[PDB]
């Protein structure tokens, strides 16, 4: 069994690009990955796993979003510092 802290990993951000804009998420974040060594290196090799927030379903707001990470092998364990983040959901236009 292998471990490894990465740094700076981005946070990729998904919700209604065309309605909204949203502020709040770090830009980097770091994970912590253990499992097989070959596999736990491969990923510090190429980095191809994804963090994101998935803000899909959100309403306009403020809010707070925890971490997910895709694109990543089953046998590894993965965890994201910070876990949670706050975000702010806002709409582009404004109605005041
Ligand atoms: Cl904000």
Known sequence: ???????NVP??????????????????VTVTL????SIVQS??????????????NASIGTQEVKLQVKDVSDRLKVKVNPATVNVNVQEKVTKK
């Open 1 to 7: 069994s292998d471990s490894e802290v990465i740094e």
């Open 11 to 28: 946070v990729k951000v998904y919700y209604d690009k065309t309605n909204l804009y949203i502020s709040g998420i770090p830009e980097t």
């Open 34 to 37: 253990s499992g097989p060594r």
């Open 43 to 56: 990923a510090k090799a190429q980095q191809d796993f994804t963090v994101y927030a998935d803000l899909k």
